[PDB]
Coordinates of C-alpha atoms in Angstrom, one line a residue:
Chain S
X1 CA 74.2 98.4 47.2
X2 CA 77.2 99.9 48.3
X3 CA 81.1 100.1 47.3
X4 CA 83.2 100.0 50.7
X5 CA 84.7 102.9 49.6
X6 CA 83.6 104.8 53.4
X7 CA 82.0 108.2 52.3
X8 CA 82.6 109.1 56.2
X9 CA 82.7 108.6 59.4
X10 CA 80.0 109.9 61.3
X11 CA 80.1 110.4 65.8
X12 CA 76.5 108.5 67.2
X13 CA 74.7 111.5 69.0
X14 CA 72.0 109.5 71.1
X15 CA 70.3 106.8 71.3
X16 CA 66.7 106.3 72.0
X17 CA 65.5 102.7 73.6
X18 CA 62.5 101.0 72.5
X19 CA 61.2 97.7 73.1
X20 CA 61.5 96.5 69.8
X21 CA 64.5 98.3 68.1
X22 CA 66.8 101.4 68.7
X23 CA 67.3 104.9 67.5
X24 CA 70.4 106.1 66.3
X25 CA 71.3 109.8 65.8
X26 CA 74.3 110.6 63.6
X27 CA 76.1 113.3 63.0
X28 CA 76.9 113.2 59.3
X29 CA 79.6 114.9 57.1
X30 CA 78.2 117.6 55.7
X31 CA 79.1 116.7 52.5
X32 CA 76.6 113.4 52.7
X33 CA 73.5 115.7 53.2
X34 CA 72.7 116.7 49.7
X35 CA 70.1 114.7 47.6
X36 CA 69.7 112.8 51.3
X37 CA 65.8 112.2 51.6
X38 CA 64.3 110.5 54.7
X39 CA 64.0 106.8 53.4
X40 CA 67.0 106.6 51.9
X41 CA 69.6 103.7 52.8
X42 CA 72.7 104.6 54.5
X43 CA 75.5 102.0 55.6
X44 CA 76.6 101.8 59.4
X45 CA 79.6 99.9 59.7
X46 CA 78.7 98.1 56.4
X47 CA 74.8 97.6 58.0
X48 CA 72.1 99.0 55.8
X49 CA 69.9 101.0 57.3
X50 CA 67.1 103.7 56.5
X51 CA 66.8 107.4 56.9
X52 CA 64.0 108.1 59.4
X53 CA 64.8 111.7 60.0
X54 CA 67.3 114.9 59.7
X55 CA 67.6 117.9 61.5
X56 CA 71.0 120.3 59.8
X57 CA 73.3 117.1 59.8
X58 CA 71.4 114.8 62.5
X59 CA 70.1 112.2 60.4
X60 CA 68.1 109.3 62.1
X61 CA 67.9 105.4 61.7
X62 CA 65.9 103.0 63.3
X63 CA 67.5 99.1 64.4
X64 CA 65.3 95.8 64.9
X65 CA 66.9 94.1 67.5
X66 CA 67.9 91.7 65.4
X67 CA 70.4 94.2 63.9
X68 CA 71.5 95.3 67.0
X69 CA 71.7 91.6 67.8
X70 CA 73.9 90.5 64.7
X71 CA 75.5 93.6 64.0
X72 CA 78.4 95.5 65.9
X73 CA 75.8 98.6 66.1
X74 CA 74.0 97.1 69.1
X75 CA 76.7 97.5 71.2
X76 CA 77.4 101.4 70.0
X77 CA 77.5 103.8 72.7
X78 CA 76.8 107.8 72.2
X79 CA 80.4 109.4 71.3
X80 CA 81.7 106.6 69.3
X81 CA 82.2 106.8 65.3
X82 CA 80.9 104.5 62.6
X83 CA 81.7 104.4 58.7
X84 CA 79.2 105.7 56.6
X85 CA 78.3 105.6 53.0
X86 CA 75.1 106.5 51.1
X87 CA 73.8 104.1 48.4
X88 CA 75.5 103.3 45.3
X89 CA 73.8 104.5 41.8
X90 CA 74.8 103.5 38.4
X91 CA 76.2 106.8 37.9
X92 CA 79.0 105.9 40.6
X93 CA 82.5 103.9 40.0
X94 CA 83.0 101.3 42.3
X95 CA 86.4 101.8 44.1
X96 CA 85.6 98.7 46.2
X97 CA 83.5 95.7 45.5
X98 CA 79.6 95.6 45.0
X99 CA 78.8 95.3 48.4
X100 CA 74.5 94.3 49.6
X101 CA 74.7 96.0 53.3
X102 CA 73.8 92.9 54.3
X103 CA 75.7 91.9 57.6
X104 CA 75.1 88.2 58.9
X105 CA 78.5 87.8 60.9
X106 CA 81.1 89.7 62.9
X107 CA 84.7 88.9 63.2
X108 CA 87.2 90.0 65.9
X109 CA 90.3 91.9 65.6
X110 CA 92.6 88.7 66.9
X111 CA 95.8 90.4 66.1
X112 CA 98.1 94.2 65.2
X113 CA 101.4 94.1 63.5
X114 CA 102.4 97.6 63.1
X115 CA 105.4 98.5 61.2
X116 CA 107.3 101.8 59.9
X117 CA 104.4 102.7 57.2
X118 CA 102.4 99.4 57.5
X119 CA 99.7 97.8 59.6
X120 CA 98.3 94.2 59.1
X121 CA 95.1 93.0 61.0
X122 CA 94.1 89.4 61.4
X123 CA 90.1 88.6 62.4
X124 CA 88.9 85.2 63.9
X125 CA 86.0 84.2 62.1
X126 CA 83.0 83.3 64.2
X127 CA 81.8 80.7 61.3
X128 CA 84.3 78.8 59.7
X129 CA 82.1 77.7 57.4
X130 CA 82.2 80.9 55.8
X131 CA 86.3 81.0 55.7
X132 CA 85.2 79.3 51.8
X133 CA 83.9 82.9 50.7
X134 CA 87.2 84.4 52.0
X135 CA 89.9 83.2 49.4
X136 CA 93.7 84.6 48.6
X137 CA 93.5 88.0 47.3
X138 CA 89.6 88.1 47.5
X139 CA 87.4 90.8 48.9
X140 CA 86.0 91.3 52.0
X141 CA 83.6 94.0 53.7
X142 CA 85.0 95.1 56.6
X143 CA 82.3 97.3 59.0
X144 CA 81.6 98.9 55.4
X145 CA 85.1 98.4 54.1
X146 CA 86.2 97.1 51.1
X147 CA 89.5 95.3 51.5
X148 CA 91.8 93.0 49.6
X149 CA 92.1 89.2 51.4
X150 CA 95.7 88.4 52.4
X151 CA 96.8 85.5 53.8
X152 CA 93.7 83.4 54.9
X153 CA 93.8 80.6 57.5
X154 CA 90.4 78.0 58.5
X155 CA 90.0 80.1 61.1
X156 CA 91.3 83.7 60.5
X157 CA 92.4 86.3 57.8
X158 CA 94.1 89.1 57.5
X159 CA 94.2 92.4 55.9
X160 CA 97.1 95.0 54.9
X161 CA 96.3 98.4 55.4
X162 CA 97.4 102.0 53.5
X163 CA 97.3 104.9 55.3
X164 CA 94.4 106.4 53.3
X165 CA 92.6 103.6 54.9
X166 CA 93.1 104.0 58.1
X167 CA 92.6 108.0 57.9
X168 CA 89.3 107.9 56.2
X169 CA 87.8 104.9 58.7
X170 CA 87.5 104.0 61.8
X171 CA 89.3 100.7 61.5
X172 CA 92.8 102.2 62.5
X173 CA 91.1 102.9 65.9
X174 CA 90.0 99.5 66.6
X175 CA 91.7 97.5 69.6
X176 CA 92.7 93.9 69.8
X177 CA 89.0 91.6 71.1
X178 CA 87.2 95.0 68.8
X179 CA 84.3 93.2 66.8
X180 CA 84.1 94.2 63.1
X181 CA 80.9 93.7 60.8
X182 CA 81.6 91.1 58.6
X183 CA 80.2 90.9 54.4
X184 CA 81.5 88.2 52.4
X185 CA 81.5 89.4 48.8
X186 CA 78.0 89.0 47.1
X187 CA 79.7 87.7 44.0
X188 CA 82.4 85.5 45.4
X189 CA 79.2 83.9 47.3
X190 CA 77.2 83.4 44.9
X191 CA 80.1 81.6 42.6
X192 CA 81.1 79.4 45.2
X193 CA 77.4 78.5 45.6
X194 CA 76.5 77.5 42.6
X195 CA 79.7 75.7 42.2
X196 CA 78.6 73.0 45.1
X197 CA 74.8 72.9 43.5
X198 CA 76.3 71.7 40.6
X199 CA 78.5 69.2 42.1
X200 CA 75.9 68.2 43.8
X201 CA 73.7 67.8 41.1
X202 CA 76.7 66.2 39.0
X203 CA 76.7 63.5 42.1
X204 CA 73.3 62.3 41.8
X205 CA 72.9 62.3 38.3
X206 CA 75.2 59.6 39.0
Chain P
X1 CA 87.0 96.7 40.2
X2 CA 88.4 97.1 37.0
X3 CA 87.0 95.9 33.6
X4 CA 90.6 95.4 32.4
X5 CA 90.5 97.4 29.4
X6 CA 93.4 99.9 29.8
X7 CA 92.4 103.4 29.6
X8 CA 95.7 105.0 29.4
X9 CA 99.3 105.0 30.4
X10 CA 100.6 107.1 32.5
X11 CA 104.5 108.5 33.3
X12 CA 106.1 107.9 36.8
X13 CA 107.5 111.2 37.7
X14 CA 108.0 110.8 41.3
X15 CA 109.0 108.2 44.0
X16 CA 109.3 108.6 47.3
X17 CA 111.1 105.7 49.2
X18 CA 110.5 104.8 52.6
X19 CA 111.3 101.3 54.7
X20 CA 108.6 98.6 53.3
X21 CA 106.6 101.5 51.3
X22 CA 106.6 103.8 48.5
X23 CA 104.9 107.1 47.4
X24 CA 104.4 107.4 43.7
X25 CA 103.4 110.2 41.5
X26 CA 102.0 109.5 38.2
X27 CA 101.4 112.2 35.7
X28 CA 98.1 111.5 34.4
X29 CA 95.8 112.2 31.1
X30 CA 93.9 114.6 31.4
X31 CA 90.7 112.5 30.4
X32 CA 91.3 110.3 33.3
X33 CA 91.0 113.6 35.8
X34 CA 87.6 114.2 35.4
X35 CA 85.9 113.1 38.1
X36 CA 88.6 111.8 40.4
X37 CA 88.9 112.6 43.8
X38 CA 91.2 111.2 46.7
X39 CA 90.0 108.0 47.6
X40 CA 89.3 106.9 44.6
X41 CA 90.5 103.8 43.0
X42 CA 92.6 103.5 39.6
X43 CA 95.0 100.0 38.9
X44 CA 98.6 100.5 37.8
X45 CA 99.5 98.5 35.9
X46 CA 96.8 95.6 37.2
X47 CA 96.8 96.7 40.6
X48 CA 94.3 98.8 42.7
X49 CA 95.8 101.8 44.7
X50 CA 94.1 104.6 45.9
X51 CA 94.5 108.6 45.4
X52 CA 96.5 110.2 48.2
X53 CA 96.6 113.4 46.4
X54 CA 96.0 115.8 43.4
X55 CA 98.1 118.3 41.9
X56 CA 97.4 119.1 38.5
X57 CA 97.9 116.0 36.8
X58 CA 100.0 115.0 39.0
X59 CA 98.6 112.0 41.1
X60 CA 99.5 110.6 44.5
X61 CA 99.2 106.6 45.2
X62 CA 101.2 105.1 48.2
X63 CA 102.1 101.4 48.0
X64 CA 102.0 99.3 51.0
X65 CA 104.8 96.0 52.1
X66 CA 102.6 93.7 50.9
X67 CA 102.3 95.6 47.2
X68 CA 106.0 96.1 47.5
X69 CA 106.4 92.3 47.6
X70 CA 104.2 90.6 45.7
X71 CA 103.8 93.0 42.2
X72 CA 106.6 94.7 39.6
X73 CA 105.7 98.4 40.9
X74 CA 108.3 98.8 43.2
X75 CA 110.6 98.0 40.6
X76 CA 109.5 101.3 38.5
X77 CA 112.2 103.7 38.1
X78 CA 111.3 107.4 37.3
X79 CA 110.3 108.1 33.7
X80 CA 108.7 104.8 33.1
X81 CA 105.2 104.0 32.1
X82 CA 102.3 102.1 33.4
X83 CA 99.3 100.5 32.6
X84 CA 96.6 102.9 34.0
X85 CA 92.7 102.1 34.2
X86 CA 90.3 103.8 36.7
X87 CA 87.7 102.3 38.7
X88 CA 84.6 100.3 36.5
X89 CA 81.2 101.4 36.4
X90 CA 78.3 100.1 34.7
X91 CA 85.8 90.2 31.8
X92 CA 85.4 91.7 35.2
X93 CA 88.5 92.5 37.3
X94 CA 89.7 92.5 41.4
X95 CA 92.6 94.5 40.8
X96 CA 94.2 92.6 43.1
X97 CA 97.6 90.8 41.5
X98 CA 98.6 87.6 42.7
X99 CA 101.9 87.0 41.5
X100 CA 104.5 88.0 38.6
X101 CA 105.6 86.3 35.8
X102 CA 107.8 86.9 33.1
X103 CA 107.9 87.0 29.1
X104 CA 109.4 84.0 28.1
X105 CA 103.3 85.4 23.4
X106 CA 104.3 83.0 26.4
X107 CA 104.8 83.8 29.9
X108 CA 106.6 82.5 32.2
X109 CA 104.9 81.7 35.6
X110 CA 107.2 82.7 38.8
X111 CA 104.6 80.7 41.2
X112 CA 104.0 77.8 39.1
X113 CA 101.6 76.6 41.5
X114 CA 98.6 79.0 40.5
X115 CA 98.5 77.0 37.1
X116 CA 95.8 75.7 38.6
X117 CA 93.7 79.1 37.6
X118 CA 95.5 79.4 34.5
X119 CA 93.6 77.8 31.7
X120 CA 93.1 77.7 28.2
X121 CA 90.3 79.5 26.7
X122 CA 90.4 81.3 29.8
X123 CA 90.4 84.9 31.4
X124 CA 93.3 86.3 32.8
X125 CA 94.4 89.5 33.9
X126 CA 98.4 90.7 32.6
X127 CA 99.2 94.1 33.6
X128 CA 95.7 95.4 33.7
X129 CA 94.8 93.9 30.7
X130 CA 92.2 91.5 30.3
X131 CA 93.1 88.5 28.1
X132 CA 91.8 84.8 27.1
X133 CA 94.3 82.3 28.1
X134 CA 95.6 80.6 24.4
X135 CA 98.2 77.2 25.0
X136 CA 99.6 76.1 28.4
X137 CA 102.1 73.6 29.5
X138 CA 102.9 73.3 33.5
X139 CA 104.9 76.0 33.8
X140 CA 104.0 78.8 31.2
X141 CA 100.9 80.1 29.0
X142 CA 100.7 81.9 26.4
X143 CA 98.5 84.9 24.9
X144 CA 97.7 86.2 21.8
X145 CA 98.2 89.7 21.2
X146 CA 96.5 92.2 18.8
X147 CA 97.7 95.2 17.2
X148 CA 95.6 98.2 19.2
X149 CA 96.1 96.4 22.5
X150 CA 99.9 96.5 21.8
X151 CA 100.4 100.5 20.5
X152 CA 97.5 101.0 23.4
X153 CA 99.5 99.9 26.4
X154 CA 103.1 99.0 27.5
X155 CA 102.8 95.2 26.6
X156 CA 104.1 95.8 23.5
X157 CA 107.1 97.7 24.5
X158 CA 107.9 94.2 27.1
X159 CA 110.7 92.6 26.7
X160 CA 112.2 88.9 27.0
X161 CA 112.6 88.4 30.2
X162 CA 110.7 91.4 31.4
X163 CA 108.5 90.6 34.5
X164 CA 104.3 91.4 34.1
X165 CA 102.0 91.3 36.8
X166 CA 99.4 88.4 37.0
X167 CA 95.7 88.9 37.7
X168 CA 94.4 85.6 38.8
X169 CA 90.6 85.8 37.1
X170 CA 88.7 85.7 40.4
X171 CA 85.6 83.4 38.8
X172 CA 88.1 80.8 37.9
X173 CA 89.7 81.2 41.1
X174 CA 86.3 80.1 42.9
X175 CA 85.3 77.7 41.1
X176 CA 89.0 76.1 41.0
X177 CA 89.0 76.1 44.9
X178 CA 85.5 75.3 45.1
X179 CA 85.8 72.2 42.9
X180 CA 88.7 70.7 44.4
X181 CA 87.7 71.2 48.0
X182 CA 84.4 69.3 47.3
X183 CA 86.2 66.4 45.3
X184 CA 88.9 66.1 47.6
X185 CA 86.0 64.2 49.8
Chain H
X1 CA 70.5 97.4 31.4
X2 CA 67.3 95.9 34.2
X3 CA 67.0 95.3 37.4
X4 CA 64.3 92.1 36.9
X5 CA 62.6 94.3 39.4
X6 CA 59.1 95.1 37.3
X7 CA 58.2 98.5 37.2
X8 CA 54.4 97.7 36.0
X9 CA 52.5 95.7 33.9
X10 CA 50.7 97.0 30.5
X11 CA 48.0 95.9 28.1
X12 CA 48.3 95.4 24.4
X13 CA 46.2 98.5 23.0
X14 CA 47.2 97.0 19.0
X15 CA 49.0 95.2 17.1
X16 CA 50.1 95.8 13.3
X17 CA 51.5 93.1 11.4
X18 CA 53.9 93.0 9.2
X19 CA 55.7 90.6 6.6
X20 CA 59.2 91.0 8.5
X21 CA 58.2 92.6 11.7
X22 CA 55.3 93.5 13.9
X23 CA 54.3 96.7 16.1
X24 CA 53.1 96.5 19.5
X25 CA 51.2 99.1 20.9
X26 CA 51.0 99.2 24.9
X27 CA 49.4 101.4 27.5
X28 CA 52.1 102.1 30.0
X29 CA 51.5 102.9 33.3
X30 CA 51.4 106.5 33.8
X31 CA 54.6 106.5 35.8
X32 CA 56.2 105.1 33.4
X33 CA 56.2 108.2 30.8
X34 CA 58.6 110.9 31.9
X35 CA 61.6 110.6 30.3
X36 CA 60.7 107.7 28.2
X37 CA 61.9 108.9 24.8
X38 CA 62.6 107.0 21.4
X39 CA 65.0 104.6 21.3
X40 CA 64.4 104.1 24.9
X41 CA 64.7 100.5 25.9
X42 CA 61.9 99.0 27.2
X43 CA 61.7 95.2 28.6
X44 CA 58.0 93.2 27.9
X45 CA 57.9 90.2 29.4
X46 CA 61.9 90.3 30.3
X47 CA 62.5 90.7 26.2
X48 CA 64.2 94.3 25.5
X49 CA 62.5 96.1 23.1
X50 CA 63.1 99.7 21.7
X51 CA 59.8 102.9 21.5
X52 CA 59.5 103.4 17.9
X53 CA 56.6 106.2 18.9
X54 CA 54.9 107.7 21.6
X55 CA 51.7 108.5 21.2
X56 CA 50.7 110.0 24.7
X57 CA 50.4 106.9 26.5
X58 CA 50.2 104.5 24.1
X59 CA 53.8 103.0 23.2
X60 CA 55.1 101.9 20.2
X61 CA 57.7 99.4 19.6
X62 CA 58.7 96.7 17.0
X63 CA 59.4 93.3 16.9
X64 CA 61.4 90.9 14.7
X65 CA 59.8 88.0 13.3
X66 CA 62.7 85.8 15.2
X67 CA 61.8 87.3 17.9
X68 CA 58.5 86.3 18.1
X69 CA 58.8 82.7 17.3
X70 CA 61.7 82.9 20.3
X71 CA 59.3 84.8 22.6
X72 CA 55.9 84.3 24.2
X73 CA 55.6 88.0 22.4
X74 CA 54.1 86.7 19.5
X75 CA 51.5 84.8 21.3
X76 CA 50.1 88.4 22.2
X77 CA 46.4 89.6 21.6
X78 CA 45.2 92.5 21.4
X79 CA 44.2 93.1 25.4
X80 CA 46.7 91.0 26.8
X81 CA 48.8 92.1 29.3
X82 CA 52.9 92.0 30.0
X83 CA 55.2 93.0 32.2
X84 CA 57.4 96.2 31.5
X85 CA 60.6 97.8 32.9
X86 CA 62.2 100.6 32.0
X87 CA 66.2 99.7 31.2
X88 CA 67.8 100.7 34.1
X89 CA 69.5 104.7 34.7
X90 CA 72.2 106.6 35.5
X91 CA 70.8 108.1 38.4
X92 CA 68.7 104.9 39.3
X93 CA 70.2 103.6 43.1
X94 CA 71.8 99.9 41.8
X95 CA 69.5 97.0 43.0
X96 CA 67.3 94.4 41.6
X97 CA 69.4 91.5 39.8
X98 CA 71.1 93.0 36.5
X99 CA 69.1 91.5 33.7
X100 CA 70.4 92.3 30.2
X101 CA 66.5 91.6 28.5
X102 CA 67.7 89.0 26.8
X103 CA 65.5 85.7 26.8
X104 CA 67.1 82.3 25.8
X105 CA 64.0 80.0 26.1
X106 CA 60.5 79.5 27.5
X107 CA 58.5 77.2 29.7
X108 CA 55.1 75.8 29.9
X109 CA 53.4 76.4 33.3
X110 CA 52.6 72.8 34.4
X111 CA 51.1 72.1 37.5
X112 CA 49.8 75.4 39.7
X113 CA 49.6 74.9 43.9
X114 CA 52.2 80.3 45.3
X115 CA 54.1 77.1 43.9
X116 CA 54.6 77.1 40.1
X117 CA 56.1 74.0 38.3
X118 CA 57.3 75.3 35.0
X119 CA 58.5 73.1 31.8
X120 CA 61.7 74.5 29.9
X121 CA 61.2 74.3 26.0
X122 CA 65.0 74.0 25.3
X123 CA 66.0 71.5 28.0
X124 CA 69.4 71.7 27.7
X125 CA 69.2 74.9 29.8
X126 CA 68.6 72.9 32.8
X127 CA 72.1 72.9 33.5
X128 CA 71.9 76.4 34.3
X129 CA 68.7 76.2 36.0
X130 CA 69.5 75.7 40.0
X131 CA 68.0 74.9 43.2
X132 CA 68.5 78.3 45.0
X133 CA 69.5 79.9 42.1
X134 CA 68.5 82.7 40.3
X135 CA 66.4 82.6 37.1
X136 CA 64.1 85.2 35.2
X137 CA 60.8 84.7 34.3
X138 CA 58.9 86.9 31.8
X139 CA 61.5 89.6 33.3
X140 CA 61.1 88.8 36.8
X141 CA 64.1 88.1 39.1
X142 CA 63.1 85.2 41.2
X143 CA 64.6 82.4 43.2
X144 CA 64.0 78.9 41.7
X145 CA 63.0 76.6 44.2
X146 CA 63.0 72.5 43.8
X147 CA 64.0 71.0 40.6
X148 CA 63.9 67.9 38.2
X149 CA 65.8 67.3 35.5
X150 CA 62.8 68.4 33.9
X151 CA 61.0 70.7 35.5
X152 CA 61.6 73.6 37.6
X153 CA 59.2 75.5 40.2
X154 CA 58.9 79.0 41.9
X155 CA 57.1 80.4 45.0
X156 CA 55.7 83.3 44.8
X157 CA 54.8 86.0 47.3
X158 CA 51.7 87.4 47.5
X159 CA 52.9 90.7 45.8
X160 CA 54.4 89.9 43.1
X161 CA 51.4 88.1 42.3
X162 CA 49.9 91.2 42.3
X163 CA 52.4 93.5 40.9
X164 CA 53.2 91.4 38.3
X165 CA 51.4 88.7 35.5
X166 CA 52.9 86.1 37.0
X167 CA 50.6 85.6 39.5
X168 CA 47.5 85.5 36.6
X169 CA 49.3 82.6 34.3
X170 CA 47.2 80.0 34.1
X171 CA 48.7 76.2 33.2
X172 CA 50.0 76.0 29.8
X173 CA 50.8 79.3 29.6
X174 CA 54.4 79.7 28.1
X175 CA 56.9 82.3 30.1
X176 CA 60.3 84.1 28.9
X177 CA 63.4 83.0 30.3
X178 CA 66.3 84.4 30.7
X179 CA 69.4 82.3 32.5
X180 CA 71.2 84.5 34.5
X181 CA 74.4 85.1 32.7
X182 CA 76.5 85.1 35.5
X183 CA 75.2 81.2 36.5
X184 CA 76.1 80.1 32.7
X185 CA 79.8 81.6 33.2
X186 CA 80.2 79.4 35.9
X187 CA 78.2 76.6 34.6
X188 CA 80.7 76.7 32.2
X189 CA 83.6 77.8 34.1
X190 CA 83.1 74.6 35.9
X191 CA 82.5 72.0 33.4
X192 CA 86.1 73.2 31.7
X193 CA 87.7 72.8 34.8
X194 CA 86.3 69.2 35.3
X195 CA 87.8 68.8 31.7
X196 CA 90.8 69.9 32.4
X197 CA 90.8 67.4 35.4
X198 CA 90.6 65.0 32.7
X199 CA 92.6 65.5 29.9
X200 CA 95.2 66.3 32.6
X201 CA 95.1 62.4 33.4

């Protein structure tokens, strides 16, 4: 689990083609190194992966190409930053939203409006279908970041963004077209879910 | 997230004004330092900003437009008090306020519309503060107060007529949406 | 707090009885001993139970006579085996499905194919009990598959099977449940917003 609070942002070193999946070599923030074990789950861009290796603060992951697939990591190149944050323990507040790492669909970055000391980002959903786990003042992962819902359409959303945000993330560097790992919140899902079972259930049972 | 039990109140002591966004400094108890780092998350009064900076206890939090418009923080004048709560760890609260409303105890809902959420024997979010929703009529609701909640937290110091902001409980929220957009077929 | 994520199963080493209690005496997994201390909470079977002694690595721990008319605890011989789970720490990573050890009825195993049909005893429940939903069973977080308004079933995966008891219950056999607590919120949630939908007409 994770809390979209980004712990860093960490540059992709190089990348090592197999077959079957990909390795990726980060440079991590130093200050992510200690208690970091090989097997331990990292987030990239809100993807959970798995520590394979580390050499001084060049951790390794390895992706299926499924994740490379579904995920915004596939199309990574060396030089390019992602958002990174180690897994969440009890002992840890949660300045976000209990996020899984679990990252099904992207969205793209359909529009910018930058003001003096504001910036408001709308995504396009690729599945509408999902725009019902996205409501008014909800949470929503964004390539690993927790962030409040604004105004939501049935096809888009958007997102208004602090500068703490946008210095601590990569999100501020993000152009229009840019594809962003999407997470619907975990708990906002499951509520919504069990909300049509029961309906459903209510409709038969009559 | 919040769990909507106030931790403190803490004393504005600095604002910084800009076009469409605001710097404030809060002077913060000294049992709410431990620990917190910029970043981190802590609701004023109901509502989630982040740490820009430490000094002492002196705390940093910048307030976007969008904060600006839709809560009561960016009518806080220097030497007032708010609500303060940092982030939960292990009802259940976003942190995120959805509108304002005002004591008409009753309040009086600004947006009428999001009655829709706002239901007796219900959770609801005022300032931070998580409460169960007592009578209702279409435009106002009303809590019911205790004693340590009051003394604990500027509620008891509001005023008729002064404006609170309003936590929607997110559960209720879901369901509400859920249910309707189902039956509406 | 628990994860519903078992961390081993144990066997009944003895059992003294009681007039107003009873004290169960387990053999926990090896693993499970450092940093166990008394007053630790321990789930058996998904019920939370606190050590009341630790005897190298035999366990102590007591339980109310309520508690074992509610449970499948008091059923218990000398030999058999449950499911344990330390409560969850500090330092633990968060996973599993937060379990508070706290078990509102049981069922009856009824028909075994892994596809287990299970029969609640206080039906009323059902309404919390939901196709794709989450439900846990003798303290295991699983995912209940098809349902009646009777009876509810389960497939199981080859490990848990063998990581758990679950997989050696044989029909008849009566299970803890605990309704996830989350699922009766909204149960609930929703039936007072149908109200409301109501009473506002």
């Amino acid at each position: 689990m994770f809390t979209g609070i980004v712990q860093g942002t960490a540059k992709l070193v190089s990348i090592d083609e197999k077959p079957n999946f990909r390795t990726h070599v980060v440079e991590l923030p130093d200050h992510m190194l200690d208690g970091l074990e090989t097997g331990a789950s990292v987030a990239h861009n809100g993807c959970c992966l798995t520590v394979t290796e580390i050499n001084g603060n060049h951790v390794s992951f390895d992706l299926m190409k499924e994740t490379l697939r579904i995920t915004n990591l596939g199309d990574l190149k060396v030089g390019d930053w992602v958002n990174v944050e180690r897994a969440a323990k009890f002992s840890d507040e949660i300045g976000g939203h209990l996020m899984s790492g679990h990252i099904m669909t992207t969205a793209e970055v359909a529009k910018i409006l930058t003001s003096e000391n504001n910036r408001q980002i709308w995504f396009k959903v690729q599945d509408s279908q999902l725009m019902k786990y996205i409501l008014y003042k909800g949470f929503i992962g964004i390539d690993g970041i927790s962030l409040t819902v604004g105004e939501v359409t049935p096809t888009r959303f958007c997102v208004h963004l602090i500068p703490e945000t946008l210095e601590r993330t990569t999100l501020g560097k993000k152009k229009l077209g840019a594809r962003v790992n999407i997470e619907i919140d975990p708990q906002t899902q499951a509520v919504v879910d069990t909300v049509e079972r029961v309906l459903a259930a209510r409709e038969n049972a009559m």
